[PDB]
């Protein structure tokens, strides 16, 4: 039901009502249904529907989120029109809850890339800059899209944070680490040039970008922009089900097929009819010495 309406807009209240229909029908939502609902939220890029699902349908389950679930949640929150800081708070708590438990798949870099894109669309410079230590601690390399998201966060930071040295540090992230600049980098540094200051090292890096992007266009290459992280649209019968099979039958357990033998306890009957002695405190003869 949730996978059928996946590429159809306007059915968000139907998704919100379907999740409320499980309780009168006796069903409880599992992680597959939450990943499909967040897949709908990430494909329709609404954002408020994923927060509405998370706040009053997913918190009460007290279950462990899969990395695909966190990836679809941050893809819904980042790509939506007019994001809020409440979505940043829910994404930070979901990232810390995912890191508090384990996983088998490797979705650290797209989750942190979409988190940096959400910090770009919200203007949170300190939240995205403090998230670089988490990419460092997991050993993942920095790409051009993450520093482009940091530059876009520095562009939209004018009330909150950001200064003339922050764009110089983001320029140095492209300069000395490894990362080659992009055709989306020259838009982000030009947006960060506005209402921040001269910064002649930033102007030198803009001139270096204007020479390099002219050189690769002289060689004949296509203008490379930041690629979009794709949304996983796999059917629910292949969604990494966390179960193999239990072929147990309770009829063979209760009726004790295969000769299931329970050893009886040793003289633990404890009945009243067999007792024929009067019970006195300390017994009849309390202190008896064998001589």
């Amino acid at each position: 039901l949730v996978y059928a309406i996946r590429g159809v807009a306007g059915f968000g209240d139907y998704v919100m009502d379907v999740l409320s229909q499980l309780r009168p029908r006796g069903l409880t939502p599992d992680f597959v249904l939450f990943t499909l609902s967040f897949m709908y939220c990430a494909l329709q890029r609404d954002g408020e529907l994923a927060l509405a699902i998370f706040d009053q349908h997913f918190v009460h389950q007290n279950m462990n989120p899969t990395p695909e679930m966190v990836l679809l949640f941050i893809q819904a929150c980042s790509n939506c029109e007019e994001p809020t800081a409440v979505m940043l708070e829910r994404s930070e708590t979901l990232i810390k809850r995912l890191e508090a438990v384990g996983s088998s798949v490797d979705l650290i870099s797209p989750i942190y890339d979409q988190f940096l894109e959400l910090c770009a669309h919200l203007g949170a410079v300190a939240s995205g800059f403090s998230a670089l230590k988490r990419i460092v601690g997991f050993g993942k390399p920095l790409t051009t899209r993450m520093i482009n998201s940091l530059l876009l966060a520095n562009s939209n930071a004018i009330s909150s944070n950001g200064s003339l040295s922050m764009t110089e540090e983001l320029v140095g992230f492209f300069t000395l680490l490894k990362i080659r600049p992009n055709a989306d980098t020259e838009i982000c540094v030009n947006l960060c040039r506005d209402a921040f200051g001269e910064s002649p090292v930033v102007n030198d890096f803009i001139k270096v970008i204007g020479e390099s992007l002219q050189g690769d266009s002289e060689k004949g290459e296509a203008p490379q922009y930041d690629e979009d992280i794709p949304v996983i649209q796999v059917p629910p019968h292949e969604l990494r089900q966390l179960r193999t099979e239990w072929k147990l039958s309770p009829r063979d357990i209760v009726l004790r097929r295969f000769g299931q033998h329970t050893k009886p306890p040793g003289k633990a009957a404890l009945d009243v009819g067999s007792m024929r002695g009067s019970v006195i405190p300390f017994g009849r003869s309390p202190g008896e010495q064998l001589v």
Partner: protein, 222 residues
Amino acid sequence: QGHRLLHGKREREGSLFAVANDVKRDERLLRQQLNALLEEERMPTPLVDLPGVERRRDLPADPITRLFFQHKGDHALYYGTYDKPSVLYTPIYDFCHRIREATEQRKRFVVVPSTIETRGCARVMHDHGLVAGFRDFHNDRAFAVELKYFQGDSTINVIEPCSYDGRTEFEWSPKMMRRLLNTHGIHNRLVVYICRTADNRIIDHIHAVKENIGGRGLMMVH
């Protein structure tokens, strides 16, 4: 946000369960070593080997006994060196059985398992002069009884639990305590009968008659 309910004394005391899949594994030694790793030497002060209480209100009211205790925050837990001895039914039954089997072998210390009603019976036996002393008495798991001997033989002659079969317990009225104080037509301060009151105080048969109370009878010893 729904939170998981803590079920049992192991989850309510916050057990780590470091050993894989085993919930009944003993935890005091590893937790004591981790708590010893938690403390640090502060330089401009560390803790002593005396026992500690977790709260300042848990200090003893005696000023001489308060010299032997100090205030440790979370390092007051997991104190002790002896562990729970094994190989019966009741801790009072095991406490009587180990003393009875170690007074015949003429041993100096008996490691008995420390419960609430065990260390109170031991304190009452130490007050009446049947026990010379104790070792590691603040340990909540097991403590050593230093026995008393005089001219070759043991001071404790007969020590028997009230639950002689180990299962059936008894509730003594104050009429029973007055019977135990005047038994066989004499005045009995010789044989010590010990009970546990409803206020969880371990009281002998003399002080129970003195304030007209009864309790659950634990053991006798003379």
